[PDB]
Amino acid sequence: DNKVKVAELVAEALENLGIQHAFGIIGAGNVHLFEAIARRGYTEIVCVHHEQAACMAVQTYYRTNGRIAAALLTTGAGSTNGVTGVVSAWADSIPCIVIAGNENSKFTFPENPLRMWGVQGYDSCQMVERVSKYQMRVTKMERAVYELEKGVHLALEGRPGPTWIEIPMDIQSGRIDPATLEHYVAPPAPDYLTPAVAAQVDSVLAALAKAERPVLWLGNGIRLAGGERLLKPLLEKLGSPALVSWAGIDMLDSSHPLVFGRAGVYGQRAANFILQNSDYVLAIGTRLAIPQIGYDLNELARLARIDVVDIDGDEAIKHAKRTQENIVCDARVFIEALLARLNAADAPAIASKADWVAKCRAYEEQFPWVGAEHADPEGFINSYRFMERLNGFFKDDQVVVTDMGTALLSGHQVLRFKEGQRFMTSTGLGEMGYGLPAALGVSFANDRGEVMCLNCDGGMMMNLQELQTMVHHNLPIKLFIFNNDGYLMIKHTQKSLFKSDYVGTDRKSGVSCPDFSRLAAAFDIPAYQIRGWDECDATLAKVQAHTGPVICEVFMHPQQLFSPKLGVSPPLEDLSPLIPRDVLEQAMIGGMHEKSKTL
């Protein structure tokens, strides 16, 4: 009897694929995979308390060190509970594979006329058909490992994303001669640097040499391409200021002489002025999503030509009405091809950008990230000022993950990072409850490493159960919670629209949150409280000095503003609270926009 259990071959395959961590919850649909993976001992199974957390953890697990993780779900609700995490990785272009069990293969076919498959199953491939790069149900034992190798390769190729491999129970418990195991041969990797693309790189180098006010917009597509180490020599060789997207903040030192912050609808005042006054914009690995460019392409950088570099052809041309060179290429290959042509024999002379770099620094001197608009409201701690203070307590290898709301906004608008530090969050989908599962992924990726989690009273509730997972494994997760009496982000939304009482956003309107210090005690978690500047520095030093999990509530004003912000619809440079008109006129090269004259 020379036959091996299919589940055992899958566990072996996972080792050969380098997958060292798997997140999920056990069930009858994958009890054979849990057994086989455990008995092999190579892949550690982290058991979560909601399958949604397993499909979110695998994301930041990969973003940490570049090793893919698997989510191990079971039949029925085990799979539907993970859909949210799949959609976030789909939207942030993060690779990861889901291995979901199901009923016996005799029930798993779409032609089934019944509402449900077997006892409690369903077509888990059809549900994520439009939010994952690949989905396959294994109906032959001999192709179980095949689809896992294929699922992993497709998750990592091109624009990364999640893949969904469903294996019915009976396929897991089956036995076959290991010799009959099929294996997936990945096709040859594409050569993006075609003669056409190579000519676009030439056109970009001619504009950079000629541009007097260039601005490079760098995005996480660079880090995903493994070319973040090429940014420091590129900017210094070009002498061109650079902006970073919220997702690619940690690719460069925020204090680098040519890095001038983040622009967008929630961008920094000096960053938006730099972007809107440029004469040439070169986006590399950034999606130029709506929160980055506003709501009107004709109002974006009204003095500049805009070139876009993106490995997704659909993303690269979505702004074609406004952009010129739409370069469909890998970010690393493009940067290397641009750095080569800078040393070519016929490399053009790069015109000086000194006057532009000086005007960029003037903008930052005129509009600091934490300005007067961020004054302590009625004595409360101002989140933006708290982020500036917390910044000084970052360790040399600090990893910061955030949820939505105050943590997201205040974090990405103030916090600075240097090489060795990382900043992560889910911005594509922007789902609440991503902070905690994000910290689990980073922690296990660094062998139970330290992680700082900036969270909110509202977002803490979506995956509140993962505190138990944090305690069970003694993860050194420093969890900051911003208390503001509910959904502060939505308070401003409905107050701008209706100018009436709050609805479903605070305790009076039907949304309340528990005392997280008292929950921390229940979970055996040390907890601190920062209500004012008096105990601020002494507390932050203790939180960073802890070796195990710790919670720290930060109390802010329940109606503190989020600023700077583009709000009601002026141009992108005219952020609220509006600056006096005579000052905006002087800050804009060709004068202010006609919309801003009567505001």
Q: Which residues bind ligand FAD (CB under 6 A)?
A: 92-93, 159-160, 219-221, 224-225, 245-248, 262-267, 285-287, 289, 291-292, 310-312, 315, 330-331, 427-428, 430
Residue 78 touches which of Mg ion, ligand A1H2A, ligand FAD, none (Cβ within 5-8 Å per kind): ligand A1H2A
The span from the CA of 214 to the CA of 204, in Å, is: 11
User: Residue 153: enclosing H or E segment and its boundaries?
Assistant: helix 144-156
Considering only 432, 442, 540, 543, the residue that binds ligand A1H2A (CB under 6 A) is 432
Query: Does residue 214 sit in helix, strand or coil?
Result: strand
Q: Which stretch binds ligand A1H2A (CB under 6 A): 94-102, 191-199, 251-259, 480-488?
A: 480-488
In three-state secondary structure terms, 224 is: helix
Cβ-in-10-Å burial (0-12, 13-18, 19+) of 336 comes to middle
The residue within the footprint of Mg ion, chosen from 8, 310, 457, 466 (CB under 5 A), is 457
Total Cβ atoms within 10 A of residue 267:
27
490 binds ligand A1H2A (CB under 6 A): yes
- What does the per-residue mask of binding to Mg ion show for 480-509, with x meaning CB under 5 A? ----x-------------------------
- Residue 402 to residue 411: CA distance in whole angstroms: 8
**Side-chain-facing half-sphere of 240: CA atoms under 13 Å:** 30
Q: Among residues 208 and 520, whose Cβ is nearest to a second copy?
A: 520
Radius of gyration of the chain (CA): 25
Query: Of all helices (H) and strands (E), which one includes residue 477?
Result: strand 477-483
Q: If you search the block for the tokens 């002498």, which residue do you land on?
A: 239
Residue of minimal Cβ distance to ligand A1H2A? 405
- Minimal distance in Å, beta carbon 372 to a second copy? 29
Residues forming a β-bridge with 483: 555
Any contact of residue 403 with Mg ion (CB under 5 A)? no
Q: Footprint of a second copy on residues 266-325 (CB under 8 A)?
A: 289-291, 312, 314-315, 318
Provide, rounded to whole angstroms, the least separation between the CB of residue 413 and ligand FAD.
8
Shortest separation between residue 169's beta carbon and ligand A1H2A, angstroms: 10
Q: Which helix (H) or strand (E) holds 584?
A: helix 581-587
Which of ligand FAD, Mg ion, ligand A1H2A, none interacts with 432 (beta carbon under 5 to 8 A by kind)?
ligand A1H2A
The dihedral region occupied by 421, where left means phi > 0, alpha psi between -120 and 50, and beta the remainder, is beta
Residue 38's binding partner out of Mg ion, a second copy, ligand FAD, none, with CB under 5 to 8 Å set by partner kind: a second copy
Question: Quick one: which of 317, 322, 252 has its CA closest to 281?
Answer: 322
Relative to beta strand 214-218, strand 242-244 is parallel
Q: How far is the CB of 267 from ligand FAD (least distance, A)?
A: 4
Task: Name the token pair of 111.
Answer: 């032609």
∠ Cα 299 302 307 (to 5°): 100
Q: Is 417 helix (H, G, I), strand (E, B) or coil?
A: coil
Q: Helix, strand, or coil here: 541?
A: helix
**Binding partner of 433, given ligand FAD, a second copy, Mg ion, none, CB within 5-8 angstroms per partner class:** a second copy
Taking contact as CB under 6 A, which single stretch among the options 55-63, 98-106, 316-324, 398-406 is the one that binds ligand A1H2A? Answer: 398-406
The percent helix, strand, coil of the chain (3-state, each to 5) is 40, 15, 45
> Nearer Cβ to a second copy, position 7 or 215?
7
Task: Give me the least distance between CB of 246 and ligand A1H2A, in Å please.
Answer: 12
Which 161-180 positions form the footprint of Mg ion (CB under 5 A)?
A: none
Q: Is 267 in the site for ligand A1H2A (CB under 6 A)?
A: no
Q: Which does 461 bind (CB under 5 to 8 A by kind): a second copy, ligand A1H2A, ligand FAD, none?
A: a second copy
Phi and psi torsions of 591, nearest 5°:
75, 170
Structure tokens at 516: 């997280």
**Between 361 and 557, CB nearer to Mg ion:** 557
Binding-site size for ligand A1H2A (CB under 6 A) equals 27
Which residues of this protein are in contact with ligand A1H2A, per CB under 6 A? 25-28, 74, 77-78, 81, 403-406, 430-432, 456-459, 462, 482, 484, 486-490
